[PDB]
């Protein structure tokens, strides 16, 4: 069993400013002699770390080399800048007569530079749409390398699958871009819902990045209408009320028509919100019942849409 130089990672990715960990282990403790780190092969190679002699402010050992028994010669190089890219070799020396002679080299680890993607930007449709229609959202992120990236779409907690994604370019680039379009169906319960784009990349290390769009901005929930009469249990009065149910957004004009004529009369009307995020608008008034068949119309204009109405006979 002769000493071997183990370097698990053929290529190591790192990002500007971060620390790089170069992994190296030995299989045997003999022959006796130091282990050194170099960038490059041949006589022109650069000395990166030396156990005993030399000053290496940027290098820091993973384990305690001073311990007789240590077999791990992995090093951390801090504050990586683009000048640090290269192939780093782990090299064992044995004793000689005056000099030490090279005994065995690891196969080297390439230190390569990657880049984090940008915070994903999710854009919604420009105009609002009623429920039971599918709309499109887009997600983009850019500036990342390498090209391998993962993009997930969610509506609230549920992952969507009705999407297309492209990564660009195909060739070599300093930076790649990811673009995705998701088809999302609008349900009547969707006012409080969020569309999410999740970007996963090796340079992020566990923590993905998220772009969001609120569906509150994409949906119009048309209101439902009804008008009623209530005989005031004590007296010759009628309680006429108009019920504008489950609408979104909160932008509404409600007019009363008496035989097709606008009233202008005083009405006590209140606004309520529903758990589903939609709104309700109640509008009631009392009539002194004179004597002289009146058709009452409750006319509602929601969010700039065509007027809808309901008739009621007294």
């Amino acid at each position: 069993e002769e000493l071997q130089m183990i370097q698990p990672e053929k290529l190591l990715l790192v990002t500007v400013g971060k620390t790089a960990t170069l992994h190296c282990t030995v299989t045997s403790l003999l022959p006796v002699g130091p282990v050194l780190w170099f960038r490059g092969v041949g006589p022109g190679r650069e000395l990166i770390y030396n156990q005993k002699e030399g000053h290496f402010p940027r290098v820091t050992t993973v384990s305690d080399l001073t311990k007789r028994n240590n077999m791990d010669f992995s090093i951390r190089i801090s504050s990586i800048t683009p000048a640090d890219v290269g192939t780093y070799y782990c090299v064992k020396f044995r004793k000689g007569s005056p000099e030490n002679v090279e005994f065995k080299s690891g196969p080297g680890t390439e230190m390569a530079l990657g880049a984090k993607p940008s915070a994903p930007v999710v854009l919604g449709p420009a105009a609002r749409t009623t429920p039971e229609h599918t709309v499109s959202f887009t997600c983009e992120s850019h500036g990342f390398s390498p090209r391998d990236i993962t993009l997930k779409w969610f509506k609230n907690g549920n992952e969507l699958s009705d999407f297309q994604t492209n990564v660009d370019p195909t060739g070599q680039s300093v930076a790649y871009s990811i673009r995705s379009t998701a088809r999302v169906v609008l349900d009547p319960w969707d006012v409080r819902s969020q569309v999410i784009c999740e970007v996963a990349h090796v340079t992020l290390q566990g923590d993905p990045l998220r772009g969001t769009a609120n569906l509150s901005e994409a949906i119009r929930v048309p209101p439902t209408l009804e008008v009623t009469q209530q005989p005031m249990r004590v007296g010759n009065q009628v309680n006429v009320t108009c019920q504008v149910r489950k609408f979104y957004p909160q932008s509404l004009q409600l007019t009363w028509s008496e035989n097709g004529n606008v009233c202008q009369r005083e009405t006590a009307s209140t606004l309520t919100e529903n758990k589903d995020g939609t709104y309700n608008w109640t509008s009631w008034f009392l009539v002194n019942i004179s004597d002289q068949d009146v058709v009452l119309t409750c006319q509602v204009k929601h969010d700039g849409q065509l007027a809808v109405s309901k008739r009621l006979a007294l």
Partner: antibody
Amino acid sequence: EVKLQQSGPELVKPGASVKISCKASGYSFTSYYIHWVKQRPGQGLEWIGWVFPGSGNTKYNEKFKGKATLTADTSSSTAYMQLSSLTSEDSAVYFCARGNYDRAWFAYWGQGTLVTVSA
Amino acid sequence: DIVITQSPKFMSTSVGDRVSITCKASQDVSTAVAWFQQKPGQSPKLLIYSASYRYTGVPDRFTGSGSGTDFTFTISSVQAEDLAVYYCQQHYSTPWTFGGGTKLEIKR
């Protein structure tokens, strides 16, 4: 000969933790990388991470960030993997493998340990 | 995370036929590829490493080749014990990643 014998099958409550073990023999234990690998029943393989015993240096697949913790007891020639806050996504066979040649390739494998996460 | 896509997912073959599984990486992974064999009930077995080298006592009939983004695993003469799932793996960059498997079945 080079042997890796892992501990028996596990049944763990959702949300609980467990510690599989992998006892090594017939080689100098401090000297080689140990890797763990995951296999979800009838699915593929996934590298979880490594530990170099002797240094205790570990490196993880970020997918298993706060899920797995690798350790080694050199005196007992044994390697451990702890799995925290188990969901049904963790139900799988887990293997330990020992590295070989200059890249620590997955060359010597344990028999696997079935972990079932259920109530 | 490098993706390895492996073809075909299923293959059926007579005893003594020649077969070839291909494996494609999303990056240039040099020759840092391994091939494993997993028979039902068992752990994976290292067959090929560094894309073409046979491992301690693996039969003559198992060969590997390829460099860069394309790799080939080949059985020269399929034997009945050779039914299993075969995986390629990149051993180039962390996190190390495996292909999806090729299930080999025997025509008889």
